[PDB]
Amino acid sequence: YNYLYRLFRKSNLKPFERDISTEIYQAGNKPCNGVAGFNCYFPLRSYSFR
Amino acid sequence: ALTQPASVSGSPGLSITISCTATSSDVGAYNYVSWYQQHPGQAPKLMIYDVSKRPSGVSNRFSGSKSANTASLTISGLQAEDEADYYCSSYTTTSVVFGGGTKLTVLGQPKAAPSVTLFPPSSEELQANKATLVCLISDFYPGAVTVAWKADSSPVKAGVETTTPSKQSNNKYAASSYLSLTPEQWKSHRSYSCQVTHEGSTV
């Protein structure tokens, strides 16, 4: 679990851009801060290298 | 001609795309393609022409492109006031095709309840034998209702079925109730109560 990859991103990544920030994804008519919300999700994921 | 998807669904906040395929594209290079928007009950207004550009008065939510031979309409940030039919139009070799239709159904709204309003008939048409009692109901989201007009007897409709979407400002499907009350049987009917059944909440 030492390699994390981004899964949810609003727009397509532009040429030569490094997204070091980690903000919870957004949703519809609701301001999800990003604690445990189902509608929202964490941008980064966790690779399972077994 | 030009074929378009019949039904397209989209969650509020996400983005959906349309497909304006070739379908024996005699349009040639497919240079120009204009998309229109026609709400139920109004006139079609131009939203985006020359997909590489956009007309004045249209927000950045509407955008389009054409990768190889199919024009796509990218609409980001869906709202309640966006359920309308879209049409892609180009210039053929001998005419101006307008393609098919594309209905957008934006789900994610609370199911509304229809209010019953049984307007009593005035004492002007009863003297002329024109009993036409009305149980006009409206303001419901699903759109599937079945009135049960009955004067404590077998419930019948006899013309209530009209299939009126009526996508007004509140974006709620309306209905239209019309009774076939016999002008001679109006005395036998005590009050002719009205009962409407809704989707999900059938009671």
Next chain:
Amino acid sequence: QVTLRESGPTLVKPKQTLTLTCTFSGFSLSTPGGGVGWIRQPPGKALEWLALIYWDDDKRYSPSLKSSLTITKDTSKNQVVLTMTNMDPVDTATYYCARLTAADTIFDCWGQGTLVTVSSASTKGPSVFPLAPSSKSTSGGTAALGCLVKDYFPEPVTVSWNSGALTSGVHTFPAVLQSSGLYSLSSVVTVPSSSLGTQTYICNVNHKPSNTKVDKRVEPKSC
């Protein structure tokens, strides 16, 4: 801005020649690249191009229909007129005339729509009888009163309670086609029981094909 209004008789006899016009105002037709066309929209179908005129007297028509579609320009009075023959009961639709500014802007500004329903039937006299807001509608929340205009074949007819003012409130739902081959509207207003007994309410039926405008009101009855 560009204002494209239509006119002409909506109801006519079958197998005749229509005279649907398109009065344009706000621009000059002599501009290079400009022109006014016509688009058909059947009920429950898609759009389809019929005819189109240009700034150099060019009359372009649909390749399918060329023996009936005859368009002409009257820029002297700014009124585009379209004529079509051999009217069959399949052409019943709402016609639109849109301006073609250029090749890239395909029909940017459109009109408003005029439904031409001509299959078999002629005009019918509308019967206006408003529904009295009795104690049933009063105690049942909003005492919605609605005129019961019925027995009319032509579909396009507008209504407005106390025309000029009170723009909102009226429902104005589409009519219902019963077994008699006629239509009927029962548009009620959402004005509550605050002040409706001492005032006057007329829905102002505008059945133009019949050339009849009956404005009348009702009083609270007792069931």
